[PDB]
Amino acid sequence: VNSFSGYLKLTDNVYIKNADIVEEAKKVKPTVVVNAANVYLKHGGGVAGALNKATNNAMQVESDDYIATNGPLKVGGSCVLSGHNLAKHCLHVVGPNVNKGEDIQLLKSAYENFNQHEVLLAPLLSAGIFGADPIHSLRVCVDTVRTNVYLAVFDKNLYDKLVSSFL
């Protein structure tokens, strides 16, 4: 038993809710919150901008030190950093940005990072301002992640259709 409440069970291990990941994280304080990062960990907008703002920019300060030491992530890759006031850890995961010509097949590689963590709170990767189809992304998530993932989808009408049309 865990503390996530109000989710719809899509499969044995994937759950979904219409919620803001920032508010879910503050309420639950999960072991792992996933950020929809870019390779530079520049958390300017989208989920990343919202998460970083909720940390009072501490996520960005930590991220800039990480990049100065290690260089950029790979598209499809990830790193584990602090969760600050939102979670124990933040798993920064880079899905492909199709608006940059990046291979959408890399979305599966991105979701594979979730399997290194038994339980996660996460957004749909590559959705929103990353430009991919959120229905597709949900399919890749379900077909790739084997650990327990709680998906927060902030957009109401997108959420409404995802669960009503999920096979």
Ligand SMILES: CCc1c[nH]c2ncnc(NN3C(=O)CC[C@H]3c3ccccc3)c12
């Ligand atoms: C962005 C606003 C927002 C605040 N808190 C959130 N919590 C969860 N998901 C969110 N957005 N997203 C969707 O509804 C579907 C795709 C996803 C998204 C990811 C990355 C960038 C933009 C959008 C949000």
